[PDB]
DNA sequence: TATGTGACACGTGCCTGGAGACTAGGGAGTAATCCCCTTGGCGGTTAAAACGCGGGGGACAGCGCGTACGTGCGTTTAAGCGGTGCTAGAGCTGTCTACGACCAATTGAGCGGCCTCGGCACCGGGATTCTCCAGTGGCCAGTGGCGGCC
DNA sequence: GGCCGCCACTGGCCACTGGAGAATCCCGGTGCCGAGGCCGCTCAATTGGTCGTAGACAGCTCTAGCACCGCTTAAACGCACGTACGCGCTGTCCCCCGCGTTTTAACCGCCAAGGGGATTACTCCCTAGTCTCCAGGCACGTGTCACATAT
């Protein structure tokens, strides 16, 4: 169960970022923006995952 | 005159290529050197697969990376936009370090 | 074979790589041989870790096997290593 | 004239009287009371033993105590004296809560 | 028979004392509240698993040592009541 | 200091859990080897590291200031003691069966090996997109002239 | 006739605007090598049957928690009131940052050495298990001084 919800995550990712196979970037995507699975995960580091795109607001000009 | 940005586009720029890009952002080889030379202080002639100097390398930079997170959060805190020392030195320690 | 400074090996501008993906925009000079030192205690932490695996393995040969070992001990577990 | 002490006086003298004293600092029957509340919303009926709701209690200001500690430094982090909640979401985001 | 409203039964200078614990000798008004959510939070993270245990025990009593289990789950071990 | 008390520390029955003798067998220690994986070394090749330099943007000092919270004090209440009743229910103990570990077989699904190919990396040319900087008018206050007044 | 207030010009400052320039993506084309799918092996998953036993159940019990009731008193609560604290403004120096230039060493690519990880084989050292037994520590009980409270 929890590896086909996380696969459709990633086959979704997948098809956002125009791509057939899955990478790691699509999994670390897809494992930080569900909460129920971030939370899971935390402490859990995925190889060459990257980093979510987040820039605070302050960080933004004006 | 000769092209110049303001400061922090070019900051802002790059901020938005490494979250996009994934690879890590320091050199192998020196990495390497490093690992073997301070694997020496404890037992001596240890041989390192590849393998795991690169998942040394990868949870290294992910580790830096998440306290560098924390650092933000602080200095954002501070009502700076400035990273600082005592920015990490707090971050260490609220993690329990 | 014998090395010394390979910390400074570990260059700035590859600090500052590291903080803009980790969203910094604006970096101290006094921050880079801080994080230097900092990396550093982590390193030998779970290189510490992983030669006491190894040496357990009757082994001079480190293995990821080992690594990924050392990594979750601390409660920092990676994937992607043959776990 | 009615003695009065400037600020900070007397909170310092029972921050050291509270460092010094191991006593529990919350109302027991309330905490009993919202601990029953809480876990009637999972399941009802349930029934507690004492030192089962004692240990929660010390569980709970142990966590809230450092949170606290964890907050004055950052409130002192910032320059500033007085706690404010932002540190308090702070503290509970740099420790992953 | 039920109860609607025990949050409030920890008071303002309950919170005053644990901060003066804390080491915090200045606190504002809307720091209260927020941490009743928060250590409400707490609460029923510890309290889920701990009704966890003690069904699974077929229990309908907590006890105590179910408490110190699910303490130890959350990397806040508890000595004193172990057995 | 006084004290009086109950927690704490120690005497005592006990039984059960640790230990002594023996056994069987099997997990680990050890020899070989080999080969695969790791180490060691040269030479282009830049990307990256480093160096420098103006210069904007940011930490940070100072101040005012208006506030929200420390401090003090009387009140109510509800926390806390303590005392009784009583019961859910945790927990302890016979029972016998579901159920699951264990032994012989055998296979077929899951893993090693190969091959190829198409998803995907790389590159180069447009299109885009943003942003930063030269103008661009409005606004506001500075400024000189003018007319009335004394 | 000079002065003063008013009035109209004016210059500088500040938000707005268009365009240029460079970064960024996107589109199309090209190679190229991991995906994955097919094929052969094998070992372990399954089937079947057995023995023993783990635990669910039944049943009791006694005990700890729940409720209540009354007293008490300190804690909470709420109001008064001062003061110090966030904190925004202003400014000011100076600190990294963008933009180059140099330079250097990382890396790839290739090549040679060997060594120790792993694998198989053999062995035997050790230990789990069984029977017997007895004493070590635990429950229970009971005096007693450390110290909490009081002054």
Redesign the interface.
């Known amino acids: 169960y929890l590896t086909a919800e996380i696969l459709e995550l990633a086959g979704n990712a997948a098809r956002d970022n125009k791509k057939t196979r899955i990478i790691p970037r699509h999994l670390q995507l897809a494992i930080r923006n569900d909460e129920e699975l971030n939370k899971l995960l935390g402490r859990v580091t995925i190889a060459q995952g990257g980093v979510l795109p987040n820039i605070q607001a302050v960080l933004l000009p004006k | 005159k000769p092209h110049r940005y303001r400061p ?2 070019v ?2 720029r ?14 192998k080889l ?2 390497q ?11 001596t ?5 590849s ?2 100097v ?3 390398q ?17 200095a ?4 700076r ?15 329990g370090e | 074979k014998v090395l010394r400074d390979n910390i400074q090996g570990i260059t700035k501008p590859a600090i500052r790589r590291l903080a803009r993906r980790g969203g910094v925009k604006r970096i101290s000079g006094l921050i880079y041989e801080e994080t230097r030192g900092v990396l550093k205690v982590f390193l030998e932490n779970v290189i510490r870790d992983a030669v006491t695996y190894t040496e357990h393995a009757k082994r001079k040969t480190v293995t990821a096997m080992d690594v990924v070992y050392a990594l979750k001990r601390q409660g920092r577990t990676l994937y992607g290593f043959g776990g």
């Open positions: 922090g586009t900051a802002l790059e901020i938005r290529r490494y979250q996009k890009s994934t690879e890590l952002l320091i050199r020196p990495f050197r490093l690992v073997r030379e301070i694997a020496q202080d404890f037992k002639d240890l041989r390192f697969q393998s795991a690169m998942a040394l990868e949870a290294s930079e992910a580790y830096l990376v998440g306290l560098f997170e924390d650092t933000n959060l602080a954002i805190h501070a009502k936009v400035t990273i600082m020392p005592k920015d990490i030195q707090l971050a260490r320690r609220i993690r």
